[PDB]
Amino acid sequence: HMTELLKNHVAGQWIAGTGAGITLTDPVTGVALVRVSSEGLDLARAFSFAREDGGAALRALTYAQRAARLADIVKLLQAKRGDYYAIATANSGTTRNDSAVDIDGGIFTLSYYAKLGASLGEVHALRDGSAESLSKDRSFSAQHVLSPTRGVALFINAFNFPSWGLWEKAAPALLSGVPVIVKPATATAWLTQRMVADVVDAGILPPGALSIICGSSAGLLDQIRSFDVVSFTGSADTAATLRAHPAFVQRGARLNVEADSLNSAILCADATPDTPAFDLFIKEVVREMTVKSGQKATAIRRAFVPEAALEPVLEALKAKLAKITVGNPRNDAVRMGSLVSREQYENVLAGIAALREEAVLAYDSSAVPLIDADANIAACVAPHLFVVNDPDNATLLHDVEVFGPVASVAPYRVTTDTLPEAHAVALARRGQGSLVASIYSNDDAHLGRLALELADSHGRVHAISPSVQHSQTGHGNVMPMSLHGGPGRAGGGEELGGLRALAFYHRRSAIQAASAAIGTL
Amino acid sequence: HMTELLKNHVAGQWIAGTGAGITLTDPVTGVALVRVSSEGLDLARAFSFAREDGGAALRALTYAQRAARLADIVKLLQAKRGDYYAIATANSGTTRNDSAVDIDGGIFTLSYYAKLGASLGEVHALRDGSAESLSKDRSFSAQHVLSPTRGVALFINAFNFPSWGLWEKAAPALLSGVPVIVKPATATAWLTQRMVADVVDAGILPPGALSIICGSSAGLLDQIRSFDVVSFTGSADTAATLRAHPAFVQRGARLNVEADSLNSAILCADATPDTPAFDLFIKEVVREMTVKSGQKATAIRRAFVPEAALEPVLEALKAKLAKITVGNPRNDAVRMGSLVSREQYENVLAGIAALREEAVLAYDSSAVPLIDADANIAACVAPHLFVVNDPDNATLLHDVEVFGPVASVAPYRVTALPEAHAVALARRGQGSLVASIYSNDDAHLGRLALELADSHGRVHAISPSVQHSQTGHGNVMPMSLHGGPGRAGGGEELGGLRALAFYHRRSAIQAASAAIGTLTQATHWPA
Numbered sequence A: 001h002m003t004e005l006l007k008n009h010v011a012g013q014w015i016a017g018t019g020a021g022i023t024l025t026d027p028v029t030g031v032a033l034v035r036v037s038s039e040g041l042d043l044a045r046a047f048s049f050a051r052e053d054g055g056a057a058l059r060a061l062t063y064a065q066r067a068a069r070l071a072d073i074v075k076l077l078q079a080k081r082g083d084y085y086a087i088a089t090a091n092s093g094t095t096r097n098d099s100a101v102d103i104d105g106g107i108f109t110l111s112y113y114a115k116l117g118a119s120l121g122e123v124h125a126l127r128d129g130s131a132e133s134l135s136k137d138r139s140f141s142a143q144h145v146l147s148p149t150r151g152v153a154l155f156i157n158a159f160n161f162p163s164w165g166l167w168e169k170a171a172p173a174l175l176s177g178v179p180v181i182v183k184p185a186t187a188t189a190w191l192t193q194r195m196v197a198d199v200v201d202a203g204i205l206p207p208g209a210l211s212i213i214c215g216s217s218a219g220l221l222d223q224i225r226s227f228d229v230v231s232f233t234g235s236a237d238t239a240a241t242l243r244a245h246p247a248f249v250q251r252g253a254r255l256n257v258e259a260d261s262l263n264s265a266i267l268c269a270d271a272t273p274d275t276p277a278f279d280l281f282i283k284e285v286v287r288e289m290t291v292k293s294g295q296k297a298t299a300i301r302r303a304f305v306p307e308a309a310l311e312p313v314l315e316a317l318k319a320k321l322a323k324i325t326v327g328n329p330r331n332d333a334v335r336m337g338s339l340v341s342r343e344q345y346e347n348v349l350a351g352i353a354a355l356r357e358e359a360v361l362a363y364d365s366s367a368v369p370l371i372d373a374d375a376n377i378a379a380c381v382a383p384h385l386f387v388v389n390d391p392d393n394a395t396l397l398h399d400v401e402v403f404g405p406v407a408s409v410a411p412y413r414v415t416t417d418t419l420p421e422a423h424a425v426a427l428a429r430r431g432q433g434s435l436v437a438s439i440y441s442n443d444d445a446h447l448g449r450l451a452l453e454l455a456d457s458h459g460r461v462h463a464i465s466p467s468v469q470h471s472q473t474g475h476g477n478v479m480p481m482s483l484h485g486g487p488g489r490a491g492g493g494e495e496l497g498g499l500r501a502l503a504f505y506h507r508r509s510a511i512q513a514a515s516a517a518i519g520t521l
Numbered sequence B: 001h002m003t004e005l006l007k008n009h010v011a012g013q014w015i016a017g018t019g020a021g022i023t024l025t026d027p028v029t030g031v032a033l034v035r036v037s038s039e040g041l042d043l044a045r046a047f048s049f050a051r052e053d054g055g056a057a058l059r060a061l062t063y064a065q066r067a068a069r070l071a072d073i074v075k076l077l078q079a080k081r082g083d084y085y086a087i088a089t090a091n092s093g094t095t096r097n098d099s100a101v102d103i104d105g106g107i108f109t110l111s112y113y114a115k116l117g118a119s120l121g122e123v124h125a126l127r128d129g130s131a132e133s134l135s136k137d138r139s140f141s142a143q144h145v146l147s148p149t150r151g152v153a154l155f156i157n158a159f160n161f162p163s164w165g166l167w168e169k170a171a172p173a174l175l176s177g178v179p180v181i182v183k184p185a186t187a188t189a190w191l192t193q194r195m196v197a198d199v200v201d202a203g204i205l206p207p208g209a210l211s212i213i214c215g216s217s218a219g220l221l222d223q224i225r226s227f228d229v230v231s232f233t234g235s236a237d238t239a240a241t242l243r244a245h246p247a248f249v250q251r252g253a254r255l256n257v258e259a260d261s262l263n264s265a266i267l268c269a270d271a272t273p274d275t276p277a278f279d280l281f282i283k284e285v286v287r288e289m290t291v292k293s294g295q296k297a298t299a300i301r302r303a304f305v306p307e308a309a310l311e312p313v314l315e316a317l318k319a320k321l322a323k324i325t326v327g328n329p330r331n332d333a334v335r336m337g338s339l340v341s342r343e344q345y346e347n348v349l350a351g352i353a354a355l356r357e358e359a360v361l362a363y364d365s366s367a368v369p370l371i372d373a374d375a376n377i378a379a380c381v382a383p384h385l386f387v388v389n390d391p392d393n394a395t396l397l398h399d400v401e402v403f404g405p406v407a408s409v410a411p412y413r414v415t416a417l418p419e420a421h422a423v424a425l426a427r428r429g430q431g432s433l434v435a436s437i438y439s440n441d442d443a444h445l446g447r448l449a450l451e452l453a454d455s456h457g458r459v460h461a462i463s464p465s466v467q468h469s470q471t472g473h474g475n476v477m478p479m480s481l482h483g484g485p486g487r488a489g490g491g492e493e494l495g496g497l498r499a500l501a502f503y504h505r506r507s508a509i510q511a512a513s514a515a516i517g518t519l520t521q522a523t524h525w526p527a
């Protein structure tokens, strides 16, 4: 009586919501951690203060001056990592290595943009492309520019990456001079709020540049105006509710959606059991099923393998999944901790029961005793591997996402005329647009060709082969220099991609003028 | 016996809509011209044949092969211009010079993209930027690529540019390998239909690459799927209607909007009545009020001038507006023809009465008899110039667009940039396609343009050194972006190569060096 109620940071001040708030709990032990509440906040003043005071203050700084602030945030978060790992263990139930993906993946992405931003220099707008003549005598020309939007960036973030979900978006928004309002998902909000508190307490950014609201979302979209941008990460259903709001349909504010995705892994026809690419496929499937207990939007959900390879693949995945120990991440023998909440436990188990209506369960370690955890309290789900023998007539295989340590293997028919993986491509496309597909072969040139065939349906194609066993950055790990997003079911969004992320935060304009006026910006 | 019912081109066939159809009429003479109807069409097959056959056939071609098809369309349109000018005179009521903005504007933009497109090369995917190492030893890298979306592009186009609105969209779409379904505005659909009929009858593009539906738009959006794209031009209110549809809210199809825009012209403080930039401002205002009777979305609607220059600017605009004779475009003495319809005529006259409740009418030649037209049949409206002396507290100036030969002048307090108040005033239009700025000092234009750029999709600076070369406040050069934030729709079109992204899917490919090389051999981007 009672755990800490975490304050919101709005209009440059720390303000508590009213009422009892919503308790965040440890998903292994059931302990009450902290509470949130957005009840009673003055949302009009929160958004106006950020839009006017925050934006004016950030726009007065150059890109390089904002990058320097980002670099100062890096050093701050680096110094406080021990506090962040203790929050992540308790609130998210992740192993240290899995919590590093959030915490140190966040810090690495912020540092990447601090470095990119230093290169942009001491200016207040960016050139887009080169100058172009608009006249035979070259007296009149055009230059396109990017200028920071006179709005706010509202981030409605998913539960699985409280730190990286914040920094992957906030690094390009703040480098672009746009003030940020983050709204983390309630169940795991604590790390987000503590990182925002540490950065606000250090006074590195101007008042109004960084705000946080935790608790109910009611009322937030009603404050969004036509120069604002919104970045939503979460379910496709929720996204479709947000898309209908007047902020987007009437006022035209920008929206980015990152949603559900049934990411594929395709084992190439050449990559037979006696070849090194085969073991890289089994290892990457097990890693993407088990890191964060499969709670990445980019995890492999569908693995397509030649018909001839079906049994050796199932045998090899079963042997490797059996080495994944499950339980309390405080125990150094545990390889995989819990899902983020008991509610997500129930949702994952429903989703496993749903898939089992159409697929055979090949591997399920649910009966292996948990390590230092009570299965009636903890939100630990064991790996489950499904096999779908006829993926062409399968419904659920290509439609139903289980956001847990769950994946389905299906065979495809190798094409033996003139790509051998043509059927696998078609099957991946049945996912109706995904964030990522990975492909595995012993032949690097072949992978460049197959990748082009998956590019129109996947925001990223990730090719693993023996030459890069040591250097490939992971199927599900999002490198900030690369695009993150995908068409169709994955939301039609784009994030990251290095400098490509700044466009969402800017307004592009064609300036057409005397050529002298053009030369000097 | 009735006027011609224009057929639709859908699923590779010409099909008539059923019923009596909708009559299009000459807005000067009231003569019935042609009819349209989309009643009874099989929209499911219209969209699937386009998406499947037309998309596969265009994607089998390289960029440079598609560009060469665009170039053959330019030659076909150029040969048929006499027919297009006759249809524009009758259906739109524009002078020859003004009809040229649509017809020759549309052919110029298509030819621009045919030339540009030849530089995209003999490949099926485009390279976006360069490889970036993901590894200390450089064994593993990332290359982004652009692939044509496996969808259709649906164009819902505005009345004012039946030719340019089609080709400014269709050139980058077909260059990108995406099949087109165009739905022109009904009132002026004839030229769009006839240009699509000439092109389809020539067999330049594969079957399914180019379709047209005229008449009711019922049921079109219901056929849009998640890899399709839609490009809308028209009113902000219609755009917000479309945005709510499931095609966008549930299925995520891309949508571009080009909408209402109260575009500004700002006379800089140095550009006093004794200087050359002053006269360039008076001329550009008059041209944008009068070309097509002001029915460009980019026309100047708000002209902001220093307080001291207000009276000389009104005097000078009056004198130049009075040279504009109005009437039948068949008569060579006429400098400005009609609006596109009698419904637009009634909207514009209601909008003029609305503005007049809050502004002084400084010029109006409505009492001058029309040349070879009956003012009670013709949709002609004379130029009207309003003056708003207090634009800070003005309740309509910054919010109400009259899509006719109508503009408002307002003074600003000279100040920081001398034009700071004019920039704030321009921003009160809530986001526009274009602002133009006028000064004798080319060293002053860049700073002021940067201050307008976050609220305008284009900033067009006119000064004496470019009196002979500047391309026009309202004329949309295809190499430059067209679109604007806020009220103007939040969209982007044209901008040369920038127009291709709307029709492609971007992907990051992360792979061994040799796989990056193999995929790179199959892409291109111009130098």
Ligand SMILES: NC(=O)c1ccc[n+]([C@@H]2O[C@H](COP(=O)([O-])OP(=O)(O)OC[C@H]3O[C@@H](n4cnc5c(N)ncnc54)[C@H](OP(=O)(O)O)[C@@H]3O)[C@@H](O)[C@H]2O)c1
Binding pocket: A156, A157, A158, A159, A160, A161, A183, A184, A185, A186, A215, A216, A217, A218, A220, A221, A233, A234, A235, A236, A238, A239, A241, A242, A258, A259, A260, A261, A296, A297, A403
């Ligand atoms: N694609 C990516 O890059 C990526 C990365 C990580 C995770 N993910 C995704 O993470 C998901 C987790 O999200 P979820 O399935 O648990 O639930 P969710 O419903 O997608 O997310 C809920 C958040 O959205 C808010 N919200 C709901 N309705 C709203 C409205 N009308 N206006 C504003 N906000 C509203 C909620 O606010 P309240 O607190 O008011 O409920 C909460 O903040 C996964 O299932 C997966 O699809 C995606």
Ligand SMILES: NC(=O)c1ccc[n+]([C@@H]2O[C@H](COP(=O)([O-])OP(=O)(O)OC[C@H]3O[C@@H](n4cnc5c(N)ncnc54)[C@H](OP(=O)(O)O)[C@@H]3O)[C@@H](O)[C@H]2O)c1
Binding pocket: B156, B157, B158, B159, B160, B183, B184, B185, B186, B187, B215, B217, B233, B234, B235, B236, B238, B239, B241, B242, B258, B259, B260, B296, B297, B403
């Ligand atoms: N680049 C640009 O920004 C740009 C360019 C030119 C014009 N404009 C605007 O052009 C306007 C023409 O539009 P408008 O005001 O006459 O009306 P509008 O309703 O906005 O019409 C534009 C287009 O949308 C169609 N349309 C209307 N309602 C629709 C619906 N519910 N579903 C699908 N399509 C629908 C119209 O078809 P029907 O004609 O057959 O009704 C027409 O093809 C002018 O008023 C002007 O304000 C903007």
